Structure formats: C-alpha cells, structure tokens
C-alpha cells in the first residue's frame, strides 16, 4: 500500500509560475528555479520573493538588530573568532542592570540591548505590514496577518511586562542558552509558572495544535489517493475524499468538522496558544507575584504529607534575606 510520503515522479515545466498573480506596485525579485530535493517532499519550485517598501525596511532594521547582537556576543569573547564559534550558544547580549529601572542605561551595560530590541521590534512590525499588504494584493483574506499578530502579541509582552514591573532588567537576553536561563529564572522568581492558569491554557492549545495537525495531516494523506489534498476543490465541490474524512472522525469520536471548518479549528488553536500566553505573562509580577500561592488560594494545589516540620525558633532562624547588591570591595580580614 502506497503511503504517499514522498514523490517518486516529479514533472518540470519550462515556463513557470513564480511570475506572480497580477500584483501592482513593488518588484518580483529573482527568477524561479526547481530543487529536486524540494520536489521529493513538496513542490519543487524555489523562486521569486516580493518585498516592497515595508519588506526592504524590515530587512534593513532587522539586519542592524542581528549585527548589534552578534557584535556584542563576539566582543564578549574578546573578539576571538574561535571562542565565538566554540562558545556561541552560551553568549548573550544582556539587558540593563535592575537599579536603572526604565532609565537609559550605559552603552555596554544594556544600552546596546535596548537598541537591538528596538530595531528588532520595528523590523517585526514592518514585516507584519509587508504580509498584510501582500495578502490584500493577492486578493486574499486577512487570516494570516491576524494569526501573525497573535505571535507578535506574546513577543510584545516581553516588553510590556518589564515595563509594567518597572525595569528593563527583566527583559529576555538575546542568546541561545541565556534566554533559556531567563525562562527558568522567570518561573523561579514568580513562584512556579505551572500554576499560572493562562500558562496552563497556553500549553493546552500548544498540545492541541500538535493533536490537530497530526490528525489533519494524517487524514488528508489517508484520502490523498482520492484527491483529498485538493482541499479547495473539496470545499467548493465536495468529493468522496471529503465525505470519507468526515465519516472517519464521526464514526471514531462521534462528531466531525468539514474540509473548510477544520482549518478554523487549526487557526484558533494556534492563535490561542500565544494569545493566552501573553495574558499570562502580563498578569505575572503585576497582579500575581507567586503563582503557587495563587494556586493554593484558588484550590489548584494537591496536598502532600509534610516532609519536614519547623519549630518556632527555626521559623525565625531559617528566614533569610532578600538578595541584595554584590560586594563592591575586596576586604582584607587581617585584623
């Protein structure tokens, strides 16, 4: 039984699409080409790209953001090109020190960070505009830019939540392992992010997005021999591939989508992943400072038997201090 997982016979066409649909202003950049490797898994044409004014500016602003990050990373290993490659995943451009709050920090102590963050943010907004204009030029609905707006919303909460708590130090460092260090320390600082209910919801939609794309990917491949991958024609002119897809899920779990409406389930699950995420970040440190204690208050937290019991003098002895400033001297202890 053929699994339809890769294409044993590709066909070339000598003239090509890639010359766009009628598109007006801007320019089509490059000539279309075929990759045999792309043609094995998907459609073979690797080809022309559109930018317009918003796409050009997005690349300029974004390139500067990437240069600032990389140059700071490379400066942080003393310009050593070997250590730059060897240590790359540990390198960061790091946000300002906490004592500045929202004030402008020194250039080497977060000033480059805020600059890179600014140009990256402008670059992301200009890319959204580029996508929005392109969807309308191709005479399409606006579903894709609003889906991308959901991702941008979560991203912006890595600026607004630091703004709301009042310090740029709380922002995410640019760096592969360093931003994962931040991700862990954020959950630590705010008392275990598992008990943030919007984080829990965001996971429910992240997992649900995998569930849906596994189900939908498999479903369409299972009817692809009957033309089920021609999804637009199955929507406008329902064939037996659509009917069988509906009946499979109906007979399996008692209800079904349509060939159109499964793409709405898909769209909302993906969009709600980052939308619920952003709400959870914005609530953290502004409304709730310890999510586990919010869980205790609202009854989320399962009880376990006590692992230790403190006496009252231990309760006073074992309180620490909140962490302060680092020692700005090298004491002699000699007398």
């Amino acid at each position: 039984e053929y699994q339809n997982l890769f294409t044993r016979v590709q066909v070339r066409t000598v003239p090509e699409p890639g010359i766009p649909i009628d598109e007006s202003t801007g320019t089509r950049y490059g000539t279309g080409t075929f990759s045999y490797l792309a043609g094995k898994f998907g459609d073979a044409q690797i080809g022309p790209i559109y930018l317009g004014w918003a796409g050009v500016l997005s690349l300029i602003f974004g390139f500067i953001a990437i240069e600032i990050i990389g140059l700071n990373m490379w400066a942080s290993v003393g310009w050593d090109p070997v250590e730059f490659i060897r240590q790359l995943p540990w390198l960061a451009l790091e946000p300002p020190p906490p004592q500045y709050g929202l004030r402008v920090p020194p250039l080497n102590q977060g000033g480059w960070y805020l600059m890179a963050g600014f140009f990256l943010t402008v670059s992301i907004i200009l890319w959204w505009i580029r996508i929005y204009r392109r969807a309308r030029a191709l005479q399409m609905g606006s579903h894709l830019p609003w889906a991308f707006a959901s991702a941008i919303f979560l991203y912006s909460t890595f600026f607004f939540q630091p703004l709301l708590v009042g310090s740029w130090s709380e922002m995410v460092p640019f760096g592969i392992f360093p931003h994962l260090d931040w991700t862990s320390a954020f959950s630590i600082r705010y008392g275990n992010l598992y008990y943030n209910p919007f984080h829990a919801l965001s996971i429910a939609f992240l997992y649900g997005s995998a569930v849906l794309f596994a189900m939908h990917g498999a479903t369409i491949l299972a009817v692809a021999r009957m033309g089920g991958e021609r999804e637009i024609e199955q929507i406008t002119d329902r064939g037996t591939a659509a009917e069988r897809s509906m009946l499979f899920w109906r007979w399996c779990m008692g209800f079904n989508a349509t060939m159109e409406s499964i793409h709405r389930w898909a769209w909302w699950f993906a969009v709600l992943t980052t939308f619920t995420g952003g709400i959870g970040i914005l609530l953290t440190g502004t409304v709730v400072d310890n999510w586990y204690l919010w869980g205790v208050k609202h009854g989320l937290v399962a009880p376990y038997p006590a692992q230790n019991q403190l006496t009252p003098e231990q309760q006073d002895l074992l309180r620490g201090r909140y962490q302060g400033t680092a020692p700005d001297s090298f004491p002699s202890y000699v007398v």
Partner: protein, 273 residues
C-alpha cells in the same frame, strides 16, 4: 442519526477481529470488537480513578491525585492504597489507548482510507508508554511513573526536570521543543492560507491553489504544495512526540548528571580543545 450522505458508506467489512458480530453502529459511533474493549477499559479505568478520588483527601477536580507506588516496591504491584491502584489504572489506560488505535484501523479499512491516522496516534501512545512503562522499567521501578492528577502530574514534571538541574540543556528536549513550536507556526500558516482563499473579502471570487502557492512562496522563499504541507504537518507534530519520548528516556536510564555538563563534548572538539 446519519449525515445526509452517510448511509451508502455503512457496509460490513474491514474488521480486524470480530467479523460481523460487532460490526454495527451506536448513534454516530462505530463499535466493532475494539469498540467493545475500548468501553470496557474506559469504564473500568474511569471508575477506578473515581475510587482513587473517593479514598483521597478531596473531591476538588484540580487536587485529586492518584500516585504511583514507592520505589521500594520495584517492579511488583504495591498494595492498592499504596500505588497498586495507579498500576491497575495504568493497565486500563494502555488497554484503552491500544483499543482506540486498532478501532481507528477498522474504521479506516471500512472507508478504504490509508492507515495514516492509527499510526500518527501511535506516536502519542509511544510517548505515554515511555513515561509509564519503558522509562520506569529501565529505572527498575513502576514508582517512576507520573501521578494521575491534573496538577500533581505538573509537580512530577517540575521535579523530574530539576533532577537534572537545568533540563532546558537536554539536547533531545531542544529538538522536541523546536518541533512543537515549528508545528504551531506551520498550523497557523496552513490554516490561514486555506481560509484566506475560501473566505476572501466580500465581492472577490474564490481563490485557487495558485494564489496560495504564490503567497506561500514569498513567505518561505519556496512553494511547498498541497501534499507537502500535510506531510510537513504530520512530520512536525508526530516528530515532536517521538523526540519527546527520546528526551525523557535518555534522562535517568542513560544520563544521570546535570544536562548542562553534557555539552562538555562540544567544548572539547580537538580543533579548539
């Protein structure tokens, strides 16, 4: 009830075990032999979960917690109050999830479909079977499984992560996370493209495969095509679960230190040791 086109499709045939005996429907649901076994394991497993809640400290849905046994019991069945109930429920869950996959195969066979859906679901069953069977068995005790409880299993995930000090540094976990994030991106793009050609602005004709290929091409620089995006979505979603199973089975049975110190091999490549 039936969809307006359904009745024509409701033939006998395509079963794996029961032949005609269980080859019937109940409302919308196809039954079959694995439908019968599904409902058996679902009902037994659910009622034992309710019994676990009854003998626990609360009925609060979030706080119910049916915990595995202590590690000292090894691979034996513990006393039922002490984790043996978790072990019975785990057997029911395996029986249910297996029955569900095989029932999907009977349904696919009756509709003349490919077997993609049963196997794609096997990726999730693999991940579950890794967490409760394979990894506990390699560690030598069923007590290494996660507790059945809506938040108490999140306490397990937290503590397992910090058993390796900084679980983000697990290299298979980085791959699995990358697949989950790439999948959610790809799902949003594919969902958006189909809806945008089928629901264009008012007063616009319905779009075409050419327009979505043109749009997709200047988004990624290449056109993936209609079969390609479904192959990719299946690859990313199922690949995430497979790499998830890898990332947890290597943690403990095969690697025991913190995950950050696994990366010492990269620092010591002889070109730059």
């Amino acid at each position: 009830a039936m969809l307006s086109f359904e009745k024509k499709y409701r033939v006998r045939g395509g079963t794996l075990i029961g032949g005609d005996l269980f080859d019937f429907w109940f409302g919308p649901f196809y039954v079959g032999f694995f439908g019968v076994t599904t409902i058996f394991f679902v009902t037994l497993g659910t009622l034992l979960c309710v019994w676990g809640a009854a003998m626990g400290p609360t009925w609060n849905l979030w706080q119910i917690n049916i915990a595995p046994p202590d590690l000292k019991y090894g691979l034996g069945l513990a006393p039922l109050r002490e984790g043996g109930l978790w072990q019975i429920i785990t057997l029911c869950a395996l029986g249910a999830f297996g029955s569900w996959a095989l029932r999907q195969a009977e349904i696919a066979r009756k509709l003349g479909m490919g077997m993609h859906i049963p196997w794609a679901y096997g990726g999730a069953i693999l991940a579950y079977t890794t967490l409760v069977v394979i990894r506990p068995f390699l560690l030598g005790a069923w007590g290494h499984g996660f507790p059945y409880g809506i938040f108490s299993h999140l306490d397990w995930v937290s503590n397992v992560g910090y058993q390796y000090l900084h679980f983000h540094y697990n290299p298979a976990h980085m791959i699995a996370v990358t697949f989950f994030f790439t999948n959610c991106l790809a799902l949003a793009m594919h969902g958006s493209l189909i809806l945008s050609v089928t629901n264009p602005p008012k007063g616009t004709p319905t779009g075409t495969s050419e327009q979505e290929n043109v749009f997709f091409r200047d988004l990624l620089g290449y056109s993936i095509g209609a079969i390609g995006i479904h192959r990719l979505g299946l690859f990313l979603a199922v690949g995430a679960a497979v790499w998830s199973a890898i990332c947890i089975v290597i943690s403990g049975p095969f690697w025991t230190q913190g995950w950050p110190e696994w990366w010492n091999w990269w620092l010591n490549l002889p070109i730059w040791k």
